Each structure stands twice: as structure tokens, then as C-alpha cells.
Amino acid sequence: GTIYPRNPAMYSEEARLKSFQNWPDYAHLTPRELASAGLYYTGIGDQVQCFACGGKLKNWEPGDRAWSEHRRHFPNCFFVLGR
Amino acid sequence: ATAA
Ligand SMILES: [Zn+2]
Known about the structure:
Chain A is α+β, with helices and mostly antiparallel strands. Chain A has one domain: Inhibitor Of Apoptosis Protein (2mihbC-IAP-1), Chain A, CATH 1.10.1170. Chain A is built from 4 helices and 3 strands. In chain A, strand 1 and strand 2 (about 50) form a beta hairpin. The radius of gyration of chain B is 4 Å and the shape is elongated. At the A-B interface, strand 3 of A face strand 1 of B. The structure holds zinc ion. Chain A: It comes from Homo sapiens (Human). Chain A: Belongs to the IAP family. Chain A: This is E3 ubiquitin-protein ligase XIAP. Chain A: It is found in: Cytoplasm; Nucleus. The PDB classes it as apoptosis.
């Protein structure tokens, strides 16, 4: 097709949710929320990545929401725009 | 967050 995910293997929300097994205890956003917004854990710090656009987000702050940070930084992502 |  005319779009292609940066990480097909994380195409699945369940696969994204599993990536948070070792999400650090200081990281306040939930795996549930992050996986739902297309994001999976890269294994480094609190850094996640979008399966679709491949954008990465880290150093989350209080009051941050996963979808609004995803859309703010990567507004042309097909997952963002398909929501 | 910051774009990494
Ligand atoms: Zn994205």
C-alpha cells in the first residue's frame, strides 16, 4: 500500500503493551495509555517509539498525555491522523 | 515530552 509502518511487528496493540515489561518505575504514564496511542517501549530510559511514524518520545512530564504529545510532535503520523 |  501507500503507507507503511516503521515497525510492523508492533503493529499490534498487544505486542506494544508487552514491550512495557521493564518500563521504569519512575515513568508515570501507563503502558495502557502509551500502547493505545501507538507507542511501544524502546528499552532505554522512558523513551517510547511509534510503530507507525517511527517518532520517539522521552522525558515525559506531569500532565503529559500520550496522544497529545504524539500529535504535537508528529502531527502527520498516519496513526495520529487515522484516530 | 521531548522528540528523541
Ligand atoms: Zn506516530
